[PDB]
Amino acid sequence: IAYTMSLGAENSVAYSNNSIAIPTNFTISVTTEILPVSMTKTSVDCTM
Amino acid sequence: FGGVSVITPGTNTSNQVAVLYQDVNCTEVPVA
Amino acid sequence: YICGDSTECSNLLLQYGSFCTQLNRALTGIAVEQDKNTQEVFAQVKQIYKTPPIKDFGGFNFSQILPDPSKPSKRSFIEDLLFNKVTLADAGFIKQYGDCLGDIAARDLICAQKFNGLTVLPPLLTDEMIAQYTSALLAGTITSGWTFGAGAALQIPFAMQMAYRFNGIGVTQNVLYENQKLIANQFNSAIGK
Amino acid sequence: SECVLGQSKRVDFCGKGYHLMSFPQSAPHGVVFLHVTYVPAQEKNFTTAPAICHDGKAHFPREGVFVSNGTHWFVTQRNFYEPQIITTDNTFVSGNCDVVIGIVNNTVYDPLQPEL
Amino acid sequence: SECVLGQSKRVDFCGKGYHLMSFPQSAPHGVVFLHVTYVPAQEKNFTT
Amino acid sequence: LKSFTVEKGIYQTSNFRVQPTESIVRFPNITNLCPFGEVFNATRFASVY
Ligand SMILES: *[C@@H]1O[C@H](CO)[C@@H](O[C@@H]2O[C@H](CO)[C@@H](O)[C@H](O)[C@H]2NC(C)=O)[C@H](O)[C@H]1NC(C)=O
Ligand SMILES: *[C@@H]1O[C@H](CO)[C@@H](O[C@@H]2O[C@H](CO)[C@@H](O)[C@H](O)[C@H]2NC(C)=O)[C@H](O)[C@H]1NC(C)=O
Ligand SMILES: *[C@@H]1O[C@H](CO)[C@@H](O[C@@H]2O[C@H](CO)[C@@H](O)[C@H](O)[C@H]2NC(C)=O)[C@H](O)[C@H]1NC(C)=O
Ligand SMILES: *[C@@H]1O[C@H](CO)[C@@H](O)[C@H](O)[C@H]1NC(C)=O
Ligand SMILES: *[C@@H]1O[C@H](CO)[C@@H](O)[C@H](O)[C@H]1NC(C)=O
Ligand SMILES: *[C@@H]1O[C@H](CO)[C@@H](O)[C@H](O)[C@H]1NC(C)=O
Ligand SMILES: *[C@@H]1O[C@H](CO)[C@@H](O)[C@H](O)[C@H]1NC(C)=O
Ligand SMILES: *[C@@H]1O[C@H](CO)[C@@H](O)[C@H](O)[C@H]1NC(C)=O
Ligand SMILES: *[C@@H]1O[C@H](CO)[C@@H](O)[C@H](O)[C@H]1NC(C)=O
């Protein structure tokens, strides 16, 4: 099947000039990321 | 004239494919 | 490109190996990297925040950068000017073999390139999606400040956001509240320029 | 250099949300970072005001926000709900409150009064 | 990541002067940032 | 390095040689002679067509 891709879930923020949202609880998260540092070292004997 | 692209899942899964002809209509044919 | 029919040339090309395959692989890698760069630059927010219940931003006027809901494309005035400033050729992006052999007397080089195998591919994300991403980012940064970047968006009045951003640079917040009418005007004038 | 050996204020440089710590690990021709982040949750609505008039002068919070639970006003920090009584020790004064827009009438408590 | 979604203390990273806010806009094969900055003016001498 | 002086370090050189130092010939043991007589001394040669 073929379809138009979805940018993301629609959402809205209830904005007013005298209302503020304050968090009441917290969570601790651990995220993994990977970065290459180097690659293999190669050599070529031209004459051979 | 007109590039052709083949769209397929892994051959280990299925043999069905789709064909995309670029820069052409379907109404003008030369398409199958 | 190398031969252009003439089966003898195609047969003689076989003794040169897989140079064409390497060229195609490099070009495909570049094409993939372009879309990867676009997605990395623009696709950073998961929620497409809509425009708030409309113009109560403490006297600040954001009509210039906010999207225009009337035009067929949901661009802003500044974005429209930027699109108009940069010139592009072949603003249909498609040329089949029904207008390439026509009355064009070899004035367009698009057919000259296409008849030799040179092809231009479309980007994955159309401008109508980049516009939506920018609108979502603007709505998030206007309504919730920096909170939406670090997690769930929390609403806050814009004047208080300005006060805390003033505190962030070593200036007491009260200075904003005693000069707000000035600052907003300045901001407007600035964007007007 | 920046995240493992210290704390970075750069947004989204090391994981999403506020950054606390990082741990490095080796990998074939590469490195793997485990980032520990703090994420707020379970938010609630409150009514807020910029400042308060007590003696006719505007009182601004030294740190945090002024919130109200519906009948009473308190001052609380930014990223956690820690309501406290409005006091002359956690607020400062600057000028008359005829200029501040949206200011709310209230009473400011002074802990110095009971001792006398 | 740094300027639009937060406030940056890095000098001259996003415009000249102290940084307050940024607004992104699209452009053909590019992005345009509008940076809002705070600039002092009308200085006076004093004895310290 | 194409120079008479070498600075401190490590450098690469050519591959190890392993000289064969021996020549071996292997041919089928055919002892007869090719048809040189009854081909080049043919009394009659066929026409070109
Ligand atoms: C904040 O969130 C955590 C969960 O992420 C809450 O901890 C849970 O509390 C319930 C009881 O209400 C327990 O059944 C769970 O086992 C707890 N989970 C963990 C990981 O400890 C915590 O109670 C919340 N804090 C407040 C004040 O409500
Ligand atoms: C924000 O700026 C825009 C443009 O500067 C203002 O829109 C103008 O409003 C007047 C009065 O209706 C019209 O005559 C103009 O044609 C509008 N200009 C454009 C480009 O649309 C808008 O009024 C301003 N908003 C506020 C609250 O000041
Ligand atoms: C808002 O905060 C005030 C202060 O805590 C609340 O007043 C107290 O409420 C409790 C019951 O919830 C009573 O036992 C106390 O006697 C009240 N203290 C005083 C001085 O009256 C108030 O109820 C809270 N209102 C809401 C809607 O949460
Ligand atoms: C197909 O031909 C019609 C007739 O001009 C045209 O409207 C249409 O643009 C063509 N298809 C595409 C993808 O351009
Ligand atoms: C705060 O108010 C808005 C609008 O009434 C509502 O959508 C939102 O759910 C409220 N926040 C919470 C935590 O209920
Ligand atoms: C907030 O908006 C309402 C309009 O419904 C207005 O009456 C009120 O004065 C405004 N308050 C502030 C601080 O802007
Ligand atoms: C706050 O107090 C002053 C005098 O104490 C009064 O004039 C003013 O009306 C009060 N504010 C409101 C909104 O009633
Ligand atoms: C401060 O003093 C110096 C030297 O007298 C002078 O050049 C400078 O103009 C003074 N600053 C102002 C704002 O006048
Ligand atoms: C052909 O015949 C002559 C005489 O009989 C002889 O000398 C000659 O060697 C023959 N040629 C070959 C290739 O044997």
DSSP code per residue over C94-116: ---TTTSSSS--S--HHHHHHTT
CA distance C187 to chain E (A): 8
Most A-contacting residue of D23, D67, D80 (CB-CB within 10 A), to test interface: D80
Amino acid at the residue C111: C
Handedness of CA C45, C50, C51, C57 (dihedral sign): negative
Residue with tokens 């970072």: D33
The 3-class secondary structure across D51-104, one letter per residue, is CEECCCEEEEECCCEEEECCCCEEEECCCCCCCECCECCCEEEEEECCCCCCCE
Residue C51 CA to ligand 7 centre (angstroms) = 35
Q: Which helix (H) or strand (E) holds C70?
A: none
Instruction: Name chain C contacts of B23, Cβ cutoff 8 Å.
Output: 94-96, 114, 119
Chain C's closest residue to D43, CA to CA, is C154
The Å distance, Cα C153 to ligand 6 centre, comes to: 22
CA distance C79 to C33: 25
Task: Indicate the DSSP class of residue C14.
Answer: G
CA distance F44 to F49: 15
CA D94 to chain CA mean position, Å: 20
Give yes or no for a contact between A44 and F12, defined as CB atoms under 8 angstroms apart.
Answer: no
B25 closest CB neighbour out of C96, C115, C119: C96
Phi, psi of B11 (to 5 degrees): -65, -25
Distance CA C144, CA C176 (A): 19
Is D69 close to ligand 3, i.e. is its CB under 6 Å away? yes
Contacts of B32 (CB under 8 A, 6+ apart): none
Locate all alpha helices (DSSP H) within chain C, ordered by sequence. Answer: 7-13, 19-42, 77-85, 109-114, 127-143, 147-150, 158-167, 174-177, 180-192
Instruction: Look up tokens 């120079």; give the residue.
Output: F3
Conformation bin of residue C55: beta by default, left when phi > 0, alpha when psi is -120 to 50: left
Rg, Å, chain C Cα set: 26
Q: Which amino acid is at E9?
A: K
* Technique used by the depositors: cryo-EM
Cα distances from D83 to residues D38, D44, D75, F10, F34, in angstroms, run: 21, 13, 6, 69, 115
Helix (H, G, I), strand (E, B) or coil at A9: strand
Distance (Å, whole) CA D105 – CA C184: 26
Residue C174 contacts residue D62 (beta carbons within 8 Å): no
Q: How far is Cα E8 from Cα D9, in angstroms, rounded to an integer?
A: 8
Pairing type for strands D52-53 and D104-105 reads parallel
Token readout for C70 is: 């009337």
A22 three-state secondary structure: strand
For residue A20, the SS3 value is strand
Encoded tokens for B24: 């052409």
Residue F39 is given by DSSP the state: H
Q: What is the resolution of this structure in A?
A: 3.5
Neighbours of chain A (3+ CB pairs under 8 A): C, D, F
Q: Which amino acid is at F33?
A: L
Cβ atoms of C76 and C65 closer than 8 Å: yes
Q: How far apart are CA D65 and CA D63, in angstroms?
A: 7
CA dihedral of residues D27, D38, C36, A4 (deg, nearest 10): 130
End-to-end CA distance of chain E: 41
Say if ligand 2 is within 6 A of residue C185 CB: no
